[PDB]
Amino acid sequence: SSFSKAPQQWATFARVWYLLDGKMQPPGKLAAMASVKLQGLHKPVYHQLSDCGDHVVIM
Amino acid sequence: TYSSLPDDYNCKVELALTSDGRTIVCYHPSVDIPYEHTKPIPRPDPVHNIEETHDLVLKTRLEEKGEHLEQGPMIEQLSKMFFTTKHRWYPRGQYHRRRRKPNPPKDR
Amino acid sequence: VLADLAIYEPKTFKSLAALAKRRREEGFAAALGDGKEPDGIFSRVVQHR
Amino acid sequence: ISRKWEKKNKIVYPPQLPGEPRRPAEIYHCRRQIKYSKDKMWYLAKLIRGMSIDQALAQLEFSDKKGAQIIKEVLLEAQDMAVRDHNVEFRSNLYVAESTSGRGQYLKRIRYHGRGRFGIMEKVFCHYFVKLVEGPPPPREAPKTAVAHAREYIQELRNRTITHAL
Amino acid sequence: AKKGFRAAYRFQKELERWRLLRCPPPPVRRSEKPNWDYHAEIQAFGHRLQETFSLDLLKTAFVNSCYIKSEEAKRQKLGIDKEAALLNLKDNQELSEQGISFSQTCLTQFFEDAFPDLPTEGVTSLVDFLTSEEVVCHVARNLAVEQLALSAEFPVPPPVLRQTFFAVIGALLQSSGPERTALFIRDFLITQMTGKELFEMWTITNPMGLLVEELKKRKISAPESRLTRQSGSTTALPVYFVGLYCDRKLIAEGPGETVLVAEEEAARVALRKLFGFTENRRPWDYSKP
Amino acid sequence: SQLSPTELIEMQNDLFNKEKNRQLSLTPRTEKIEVKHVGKTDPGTVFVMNKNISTPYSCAMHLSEWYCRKSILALVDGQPWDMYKPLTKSCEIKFLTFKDDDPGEVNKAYWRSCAMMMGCVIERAFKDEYVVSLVRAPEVPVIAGAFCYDVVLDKRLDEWMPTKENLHSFTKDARALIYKDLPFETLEVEAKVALEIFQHNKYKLDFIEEKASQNPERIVKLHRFGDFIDVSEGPLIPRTSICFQYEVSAVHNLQTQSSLVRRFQGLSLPVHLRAHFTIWNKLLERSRKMVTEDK
Amino acid sequence: TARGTASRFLTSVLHNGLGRYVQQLQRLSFSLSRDAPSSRGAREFVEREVTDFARRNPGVVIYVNPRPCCVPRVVAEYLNGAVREESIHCKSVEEIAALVQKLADQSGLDVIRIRKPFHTDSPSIQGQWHPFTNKPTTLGGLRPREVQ
Ligand SMILES: [Mg+2]
Numbered sequence A: 001s002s003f004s005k006a007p008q009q010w011a012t013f014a015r016v017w018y019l020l021d022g023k024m025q026p027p028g029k030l031a032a033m034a035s036v037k038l039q040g041l042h043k044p045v046y047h048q049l050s051d052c053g054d055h056v057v058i059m
Numbered sequence B: 001t002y003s004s005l006p007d008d009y010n011c012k013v014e015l016a017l018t019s020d021g022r023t024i025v026c027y028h029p030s031v032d033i034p035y036e037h038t039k040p041i042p043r044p045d046p047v048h049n050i051e052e053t054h055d056l057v058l059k060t061r062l063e064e065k066g067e068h069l070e071q072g073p074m075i076e077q078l079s080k081m082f083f084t085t086k087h088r089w090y091p092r093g094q095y096h097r098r099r100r101k102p103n104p105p106k107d108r
Numbered sequence C: 001v002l003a004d005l006a007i008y009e010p011k012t013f014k015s016l017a018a019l020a021k022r023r024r025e026e027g028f029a030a031a032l033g034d035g036k037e038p039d040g041i042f043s044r045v046v047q048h049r
Numbered sequence D: 001i002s003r004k005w006e007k008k009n010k011i012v013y014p015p016q017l018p019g020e021p022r023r024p025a026e027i028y029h030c031r032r033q034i035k036y037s038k039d040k041m042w043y044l045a046k047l048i049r050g051m052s053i054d055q056a057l058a059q060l061e062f063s064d065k066k067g068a069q070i071i072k073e074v075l076l077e078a079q080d081m082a083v084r085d086h087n088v089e090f091r092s093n094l095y096v097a098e099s100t101s102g103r104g105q106y107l108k109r110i111r112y113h114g115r116g117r118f119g120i121m122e123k124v125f126c127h128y129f130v131k132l133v134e135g136p137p138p139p140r141e142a143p144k145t146a147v148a149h150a151r152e153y154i155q156e157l158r159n160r161t162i163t164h165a166l
Numbered sequence E: 001a002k003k004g005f006r007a008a009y010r011f012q013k014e015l016e017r018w019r020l021l022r023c024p025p026p027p028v029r030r031s032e033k034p035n036w037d038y039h040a041e042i043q044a045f046g047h048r049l050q051e052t053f054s055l056d057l058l059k060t061a062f063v064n065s066c067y068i069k070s071e072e073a074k075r076q077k078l079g080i081d082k083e084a085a086l087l088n089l090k091d092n093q094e095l096s097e098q099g100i101s102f103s104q105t106c107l108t109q110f111f112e113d114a115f116p117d118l119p120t121e122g123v124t125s126l127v128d129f130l131t132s133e134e135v136v137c138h139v140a141r142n143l144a145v146e147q148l149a150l151s152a153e154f155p156v157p158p159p160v161l162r163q164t165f166f167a168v169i170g171a172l173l174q175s176s177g178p179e180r181t182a183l184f185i186r187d188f189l190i191t192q193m194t195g196k197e198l199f200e201m202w203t204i205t206n207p208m209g210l211l212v213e214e215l216k217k218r219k220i221s222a223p224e225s226r227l228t229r230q231s232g233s234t235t236a237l238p239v240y241f242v243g244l245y246c247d248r249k250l251i252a253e254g255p256g257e258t259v260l261v262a263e264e265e266a267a268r269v270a271l272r273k274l275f276g277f278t279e280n281r282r283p284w285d286y287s288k289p
Numbered sequence F: 001s002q003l004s005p006t007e008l009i010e011m012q013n014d015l016f017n018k019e020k021n022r023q024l025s026l027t028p029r030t031e032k033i034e035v036k037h038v039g040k041t042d043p044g045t046v047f048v049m050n051k052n053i054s055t056p057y058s059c060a061m062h063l064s065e066w067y068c069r070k071s072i073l074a075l076v077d078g079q080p081w082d083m084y085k086p087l088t089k090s091c092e093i094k095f096l097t098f099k100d101d102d103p104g105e106v107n108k109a110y111w112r113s114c115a116m117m118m119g120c121v122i123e124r125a126f127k128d129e130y131v132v133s134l135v136r137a138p139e140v141p142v143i144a145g146a147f148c149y150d151v152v153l154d155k156r157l158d159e160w161m162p163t164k165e166n167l168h169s170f171t172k173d174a175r176a177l178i179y180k181d182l183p184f185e186t187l188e189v190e191a192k193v194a195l196e197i198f199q200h201n202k203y204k205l206d207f208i209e210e211k212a213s214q215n216p217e218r219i220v221k222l223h224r225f226g227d228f229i230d231v232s233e234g235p236l237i238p239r240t241s242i243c244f245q246y247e248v249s250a251v252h253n254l255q256t257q258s259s260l261v262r263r264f265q266g267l268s269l270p271v272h273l274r275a276h277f278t279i280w281n282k283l284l285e286r287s288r289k290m291v292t293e294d295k
Numbered sequence G: 001t002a003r004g005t006a007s008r009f010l011t012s013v014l015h016n017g018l019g020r021y022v023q024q025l026q027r028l029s030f031s032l033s034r035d036a037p038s039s040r041g042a043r044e045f046v047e048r049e050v051t052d053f054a055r056r057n058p059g060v061v062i063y064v065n066p067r068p069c070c071v072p073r074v075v076a077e078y079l080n081g082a083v084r085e086e087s088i089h090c091k092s093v094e095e096i097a098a099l100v101q102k103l104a105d106q107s108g109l110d111v112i113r114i115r116k117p118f119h120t121d122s123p124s125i126q127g128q129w130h131p132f133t134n135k136p137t138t139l140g141g142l143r144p145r146e147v148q
């Protein structure tokens, strides 16, 4: 819990890269979770004016 | 030996109910990351800037880096770095620069 | 308060989530069980004192 | 009318305690009620901002605008004022701090049209202000390098806070 | 023309406002302003702090060297006889020295008792910080010490203010026991330590080395930096979490942009656990034993 | 004597500052000398100046920025003066330009300056381990396709000749030197306190000895820019910024019986005269050949 | 309006109420007219109440000036340096009393929009969520497609 201020803040708002396999999946159900992860709506720290959103790689 | 959620991550969680019934207590000590689950620190340091003949020339060879681009391509490169669209990087007019607060409030 | 726990108290929140999950499973257990006898530990309803 | 700019040259400062940095000279000067338009004048006055006085004189020397020669005359006057009245060595050592055009008092005339209609016409006048400061010209700002933009962006991401959060 | 006084007067007020906006007047002593009674002020100081001072000792505590030398300038330039009554003034030097010495002792004891694992260099750094120019001036000026202090040059340059604050401390030490003054110190100084970090005020530049030495002292061997979590290495904004391991147990862990930065962080964290300067740590006790 | 590279710099600069402050102290007052203008352009113009303070550059500033930028060298009476060299007595002044009709004086000066720059670039471009002795800047005519500088190097370094990489490094460093604009400063010294500056370079001390030998009063002419000091014949250009195109062309090993001396040849042109890319390439090709005039 | 005006976070001056409580109001200055009707209430207040008020609050110095004014004012002044002006012009004794109380109990901080109702240093005890806090670690710490 004890971090300096800067690294703490950096860790919290850090971007993340998710990998999502697409084979034999409906593009809709794919796009649903892809959408959530793009907007950063999976983060408890979410807000619309924070840039938070993560990279999603679909293959 | 039962918890509703796996103890893999975060905390190992224990849920107890007071004999009275009127209080729930939870014991949750942190779960540390096991050694076997980590990988060794990447170590990269190499200096080839050295010329065997002149090494104050070699120390001046690391100072030899710089470049300049145009507005457009600079912005394209910038927006590829941070995975942004091009638009963010353009300037803003007098009117908008002037209304930024000089001294924003600070918390903590 | 629940949101603030979720952000600033990830442990306590995982506890709450554990509790809820437990209570739910208890509920399904009681509904499928089809009898009045079992009272899940967390499904007991306390009155004020 | 309002005449202020003139009086700016009548200000007297308190003497400099030794050890303090030497204060650069300032010369305010202007020409009132020129027969140029205010706007046409503005382009000129804008051109020579931040130029060393000799550079501005060179630029004005070859412009074809009617205002070019007015401004030039005002600059020579200001230069000689600066060496004579205020104390400035090196009459080449001035740069143009401020250059601008104000509007004067306009005359009003008739402009005839046809079918006996008329427009109302304005004979236009304007003011030219200049302020000269003693020293080399301050350096023109280079645009932001990729490094600068990157630093700013990073700094911004780092200023983020958990919002409505506590 | 419009007939009336009212709008004209009301506008005179606007004129004055603009005049003060375009040229701000240089700050003036509260003493040279319209409502002032020095005595009543002094008494009120004491009562509001919930302390009991000898009025002689306090009045002494707010006196400075500079005020006396300026008063001797005014004395010698007008040909006046002052010397007896003016050199009878008994400046605050003495009081300030007792004050600073006692405050450093007191503080040092407080910390030493609260953080048994703080190295002496650390506790020194802390006392240094709470006795600093910045902190003491801030607190003093917010207690209306700058208001009461007798000095030349009204903004009352920071060394004079430190002098004057601790002067008041010493005056309290004479007026009441070391117990009372210890309470005053833990209330108006130690509270400035609220929200602050350790390494915010300690400033040490090589966390790793310091950690290794402290672990030699604890008879633990070799912290090994082991990379735990990471996201993007190829990005312009990577995140690393470096863990520190001692005999394959994890002692502490930290985030950063670069693996080096992060390693250094894990060091600072480990340090903070060892020394018991932590977020989770017991908040300070404010109580009446 | 055990000394670091930076210590030599420090000692030399402090000696130079001592001497300059001594020359400053020699003049008690603000003394007024009357300079006249013999120039083709603004005749009869008279400057009233501070003796041993005012310079012909500070003189041009009374005229216009045009002189300031266009004037490389200042003819005082019949002699070439460096733009920042303080005027001594009352006199007459004429200003000298690159596009002037008989530029030769100026040309010489320009060449010298460039040479000196290269000298600096060389001395500091080698590893601390080795020992770089600058010799002199042999005065070539400008029809000769380059300017050059003589340098002796550590004995263990005697086998290698540089690669286009290294030469291009010299050039990069010279351009680095041009970018930041350094005035060329001048001082007149007595040999006694001249030799104390150079010391460790033998060849320098010899040069100073001859140079002072042909002058009755034992006067040595010093020039310095930034931290670098060197002795030279005749005046130099006012600024470093005056050079635009600059190259260190090539080096040539030439050996006496008693020494092994490398000759560094380079080529440059001032902003005023700057030459087209093609022209430049041709001149650059000629500047590779050995240029010999020592006499 | 909120975009219109300035704003501040919730704070105390000098961490008041942590170690001990210090009444922030420092001095109080009244100006009134013995003669003018506008000041009537303010006079009565000075008669009856001021005295008692002064005992109830030992730490505040109260300066009363009778002078020829048309508009009686009370100038509150705080430890903070903050100066707050008020007009007791044409009010009861009751009204003035209530006003002087408000002045007594205020912090002296500026009254503007307060961004949020709470202020915490170290809100975060036991951690602060970050993207990895709830994620499981793998063996060898390999990435998704990484092979060893
Ligand atoms: Mg008609």
Ligand SMILES: [Mg+2]
Binding pocket: none
């Ligand atoms: Mg119209």
Ligand SMILES: [Mg+2]
Binding pocket: D120, D122
């Ligand atoms: Mg019109």
